[PDB]
Amino acid sequence: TKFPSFSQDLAQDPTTRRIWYGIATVHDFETHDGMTEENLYQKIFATHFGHLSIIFLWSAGHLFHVAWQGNFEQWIQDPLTIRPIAHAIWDPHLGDAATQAFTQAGASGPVDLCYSGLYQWWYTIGMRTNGDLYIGSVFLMIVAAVMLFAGWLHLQPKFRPSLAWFRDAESQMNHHLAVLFGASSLGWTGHLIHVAIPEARGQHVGWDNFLSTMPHPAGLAPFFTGRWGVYAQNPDTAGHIFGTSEGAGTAIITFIGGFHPQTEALWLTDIAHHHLAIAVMYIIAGHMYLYDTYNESLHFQLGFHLAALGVITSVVAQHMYSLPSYAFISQDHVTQAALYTHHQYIAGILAIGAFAHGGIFFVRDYDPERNKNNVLARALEHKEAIISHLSWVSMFSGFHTLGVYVHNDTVVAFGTPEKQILVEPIFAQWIQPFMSQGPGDFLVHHGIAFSLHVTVLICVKGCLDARGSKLMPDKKDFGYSFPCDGPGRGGTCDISAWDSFYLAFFWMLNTIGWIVFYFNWKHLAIWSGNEAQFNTNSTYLMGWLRDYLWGYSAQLINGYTPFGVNSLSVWAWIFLLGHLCWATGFLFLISWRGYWQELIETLVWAHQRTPLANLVTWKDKPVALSIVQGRLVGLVHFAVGYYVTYAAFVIGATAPLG
């Protein structure tokens, strides 16, 4: 059957495997039939415009919805008591009770409270009316229209960029550093100085009057002539109220440091300074400006960029709660928990994605001859060593961390908490925005250490053994994703490199889960004033189960009761949806293909033999999902479940507290 157009192997599959594997391989452009590197890069090029158009229409939706259905105005008036709103609920299924309960944040009808700090971010960057947002939205739709127009024009042979424009990666690297990053950085400082900071200081800047307005009275004259001093004018008084004349300074570039007390956020002036500095550094480096493999392999490129975006989004999460850059976001606890957990989980996805494409590189692109004695060749030279070391630090960190937590559990249970192995984080004290690191924090840090070790252990045993191993010397033959080599050599289930990404996603979720668990319990403790609770109970595992999971679940799971619904109903329900989704992942992770294939055989029999029903038949012979599809659907359920459950819990834990 035609679909999938690109793969005749599949298109001639007489089964439902054709439809699944189609959708699974529909973006592996490399593997499409008759795909030359030229067309490959051109196709990829156009897809990226599609992606970006999506991101812009996504942002567009944010602004459109908050404008139309939000309470952004009411919130800018009372940003500490008004709950900000994400969008309207129209749902024919809600009972009157649930419409009433979701009728919140002084909204006429049922709404969803926002928890992306979008209100805070927009207030900070200057937006003050629904008009500013509506214009942002319509603008961003038009940007997306342009980006789509672009991908279309580009794939059109008129402007179809040949292999040249892509082979010029070095040019692209320098351009990214300066022309994109540097340029946009200082453009953003433009926005900050002209609109953000004014609107912060109570002065309305529209597109109409900013041509009229000058940011700094003497600033225009100072540029290129003693520019640094004039720019550092009267700094904004602590008295200053955000978006009011009261205590408004005039400085546009400063190094005041710390946080604006009203908003408990990094000074807009400090941010503008930061960005100006970042821009200068980036542009300078641009002007100033494994080679073989990186240019050769698109997998190497994504892998690198994913590991990059991995660390970047991790640090974004780590910094965006410690060093709040948005007004009132520090006070909005649910948003800050949500954003941290969000960005940390996306961090873990981008990280593991890095190692995934790592392994794809090692089975599709890495030629051992091509690079005689490169870093990668040396890495493989002593795989057994890199793995034995990662193994050891894993078994070590693991045995000891689990042992200590279990020791603490045992002695505390036996009613002798004195006997606990409480180790103080001395180096944390030395280094220390920074919150008290106790022996609890120590144990959890080591947990996270161990888990991150086992994750990299797995997703490197993957990318190293991808080429092969004693159990399967020639894996590169069979490729990245394949079921197994059969029950041949004691059994080879899960021997592929894809299987290592699969096995490591679990550890990535465990690791980020420990991270965000620690984050959220610590913060709930402080946000309730019972930081004592964390400090005392975080040292044995029953304390995590009793105080974190058991204790902060109560509100959420009372979201709907036989007595009635409250606003947390939708979260209680999502909480269960995530438990169900997670568990459903176990169906696919534990029950493997053969059981199902026998069962489905019998259903094919029953269908063919049932009068009236037999009148219709499948086009595609029903078959059980593939070995690997079982693993993949398992993992997507497990992951989706994991995320949805925890998102529900993060929201439901923090929301009642505030």
Binding site: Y134, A145, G151
Partner: peptide
């Protein structure tokens, strides 16, 4: 606070990327 004129214009604009998405999608297929 957002008027019907505005809601309609927003929709009509959003229709443009819709057509162009259809176009780009077709292309990439």
């Amino acid at each position: 606070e957002l008027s019907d004129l505005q809601i309609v214009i927003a929709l009509v604009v959003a229709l443009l990327p819709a057509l162009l998405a259809l176009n780009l999608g077709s292309a990439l297929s």
